[PDB]
Amino acid sequence: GLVKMSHPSGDVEACMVQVTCGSMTLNGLWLDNTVWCPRHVMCPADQLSDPNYDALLISMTNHSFSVQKHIGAPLRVVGHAMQGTLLKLTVDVANPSTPAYTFTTVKPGAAFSVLACYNGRPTGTFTVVMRPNYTIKGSFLCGSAGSVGYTKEGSVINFCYMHQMELGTHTGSAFDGTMYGAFMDKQVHQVQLTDKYCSVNVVAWLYAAILNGCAWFVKPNRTSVVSFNEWALANQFTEFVGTQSVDMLAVKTGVAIEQLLYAIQQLYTGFQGKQILGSTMLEDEFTPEDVNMQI
Amino acid sequence: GLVKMSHPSGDVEACMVQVTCGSMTLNGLWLDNTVWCPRHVMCPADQLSDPNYDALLISMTNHSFSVQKHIGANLRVVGHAMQGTLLKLTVDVANPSTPAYTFTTVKPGAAFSVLACYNGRPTGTFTVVMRPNYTIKGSFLCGSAGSVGYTKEGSVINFCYMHQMELANGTHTGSAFDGTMYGAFMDKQVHQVQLTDKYCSVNVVAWLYAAILNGCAWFVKPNRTSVVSFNEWALANQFTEFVGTQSVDMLAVKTGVAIEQLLYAIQQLYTGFQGKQILGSTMLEDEFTPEDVNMQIM
Numbered sequence: 001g002l003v004k005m006s007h008p009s010g011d012v013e014a015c016m017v018q019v020t021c022g023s024m025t026l027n028g029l030w031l032d033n034t035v036w037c038p039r040h041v042m043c044p045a046d047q048l049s050d051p052n053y054d055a056l057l058i059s060m061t062n063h064s065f066s067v068q069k070h071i072g073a074p075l076r077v078v079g080h081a082m083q084g085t086l087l088k089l090t091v092d093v094a095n096p097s098t099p100a101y102t103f104t105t106v107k108p109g110a111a112f113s114v115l116a117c118y119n120g121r122p123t124g125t126f127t128v129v130m131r132p133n134y135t136i137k138g139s140f141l142c143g144s145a146g147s148v149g150y151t152k153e154g155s156v157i158n159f160c161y162m163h164q165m166e167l168g169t170h171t172g173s174a175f176d177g178t179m180y181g182a183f184m185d186k187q188v189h190q191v192q193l194t195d196k197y198c199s200v201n202v203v204a205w206l207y208a209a210i211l212n213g214c215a216w217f218v219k220p221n222r223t224s225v226v227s228f229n230e231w232a233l234a235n236q237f238t239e240f241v242g243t244q245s246v247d248m249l250a251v252k253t254g255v256a257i258e259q260l261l262y263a264i265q266q267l268y269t270g271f272q273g274k275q276i277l278g279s280t281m282l283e284d285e286f287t288p289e290d291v292n293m294q295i
Numbered sequence: 296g297l298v299k300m301s302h303p304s305g306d307v308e309a310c311m312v313q314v315t316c317g318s319m320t321l322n323g324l325w326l327d328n329t330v331w332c333p334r335h336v337m338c339p340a341d342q343l344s345d346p347n348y349d350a351l352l353i354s355m356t357n358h359s360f361s362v363q364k365h366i367g368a369n370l371r372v373v374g375h376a377m378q379g380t381l382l383k384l385t386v387d388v389a390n391p392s393t394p395a396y397t398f399t400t401v402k403p404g405a406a407f408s409v410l411a412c413y414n415g416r417p418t419g420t421f422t423v424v425m426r427p428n429y430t431i432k433g434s435f436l437c438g439s440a441g442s443v444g445y446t447k448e449g450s451v452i453n454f455c456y457m458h459q460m461e462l463a464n465g466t467h468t469g470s471a472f473d474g475t476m477y478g479a480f481m482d483k484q485v486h487q488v489q490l491t492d493k494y495c496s497v498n499v500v501a502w503l504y505a506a507i508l509n510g511c512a513w514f515v516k517p518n519r520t521s522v523v524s525f526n527e528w529a530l531a532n533q534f535t536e537f538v539g540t541q542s543v544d545m546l547a548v549k550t551g552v553a554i555e556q557l558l559y560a561i562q563q564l565y566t567g568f569q570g571k572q573i574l575g576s577t578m579l580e581d582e583f584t585p586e587d588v589n590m591q592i593m
Contacts, residue, residue, distance in 0.1 A: 001465035003434045008417035010305030122303040139298045139591050168296035280577040294434050
């Protein structure tokens with residue numbers, strides 16, 4: 001069946017620390033001699049509504065930050081810099097459990113695993129998709145700022161997300177410092193763009209339905225990619241872009257992408273009765289790589 | 296929002312090994328000086344249709360078993376014993392990363408975390424609920440036999456599942472670490488009838504409670520069905536017996552709606568939502584527990 005699958009979180013658990021500055025504490029990511037954490041740890045919650053982060057960074061010394069590791073084996077800060085919405089702290093011990101890793105920005109529709117932590121303590125893991133409005137729908141209580149999202153290729157962890165703020169709608173930074181969707185890290189109200197169904201994932205989900213013998217929705221009728229995308233612009237679906245993973249499902253089932261593009265337009269009008277792989281709505285948080293891997 | 300949430304798996308990853316017996320290999324779990332694995336590792340491929348686990352265990356010398364740790368920091372096997380559907384292997388090195396743990400059997404409706412592995416290498420983690428027919432809806436591929444399921448209370452790992460087999464389309468069963476298969480399924484490649492599934496009543500109650508908290512209470516009526524009367528109704532309408540918990544009680548407190556009211560609602564909603572919806576669904580959800588709702592909607 002189709003389960004929400006995350007990467008095993010051991011490699012990332014061994015990198016979580018608690019970062020403290022003033023009365024603010026949160027989670028941080030310890031890679032080699034660097035500890036990454038959200039920069040709003042420097043902001044007293046009284047002034048979190050409008051901070052001047054550069055003035056905040058001037059007023060700080062390496063003594064303004066403390067870093068603690070709770071899990072596993074149990075840091076002095078000798079450097080501090082700011083990189084967009086992240087603090088980049090330098091510590092005097094290299095994390096002896098740093099995994100091979102990269103930094104890459106994920107795109108809307110793509111899935112990654114999240115290690116929710118509190119006070120440097122990993123508490124749970126789940127998978128989210130980067131929404132078209134550059135938010136994610138996960139579970140983030142008070143104190144999970146600095147929790148980390150990632151994918152894994154071979155032995156290489158791709159760190160792609162550090163949690164920053166709740167707008168059950170959440171957003172955060174890539175490890176280059178830039179916020180997903182350009183949201184500001186200040187507790188002012190800000191308007192998010194409209195969310196959309198991720199069309200390539202709905203299509204992968206329907207292929208999964210077909211591979212499990214649930215194909216009542218397949219008709220001979222087709223709509224072209226060109227025409228679907230023109231329809232998508234008016235109905236809050238993303239632009240459909242085919243990939244090799246999608247092609248593999250079309251080959252295995254013998255059902256063409258265009259047949260599913262047409263069925264989406266009908267199923268969006270409403271499921272009739274009637275159910276698909278358990279649910280009464282379209283599912284867009286399983287990727288073609290998900291479906292290929294699991295089925 | 297309500298999301299499927301697993302425990303961090305690091306503690307359990309550090310315990311996974313690969314166990315080999317002749318031609319066959321699967322995952323094992325390494326705690327102190329013991330390695331647990333499914334006993335069908337002793338049975339050759341062609342002979343699995345029906346094996347005799349005493350004839351197989353007799354033919355076993357200690358070098359019949361080979362154990363490898365691939366993750367982080369080779370283990371010599373010095374004793375072997377069978378317990379239920381599991382093998383209990385003794386090795387001469389104690390796992391220096393053994394966590395505090397227990398061996399508790401889970402009941403239907405309860406949720407736990409699975410660490411899927413292949414040839415001793417973790418590949419993925421997810422969470423399932425034990426179904427009332429003692430199966431689980433997971434994702435296991437070839438080489439995942441011996442993957443381990445667990446909950447975590449504090450820093451204690453409660454190991455509750457070791458994967459044994461695939462039944463019908465994507466339905467799985469395994470054993471508790473006392474050796475007993477969930478639902479008395481048998482570790483032989485023979486057709487096996489599984490009982491019909493049911494809705495997990497206490498989890499449906501949890502989800503209705505999650506509805507009330509997030510604005511959605513159109514189903515709450517003054518009417519009330521008692522537990523004991525719901526359980527007789529459940530016996531005829533594919534629902535499990537309801538058993539309250541302190542967890543459910545805390546939901547009843549912060550919503551002001553009584554368990555019995557939601558038990559009535561379930562009796563009504565079961566026949567149909569009547570062109571209404573609850574959390575954008577038109578079917579009952581029974582895969583979030585009271586504990587799930589409590590910790591995620593606090």
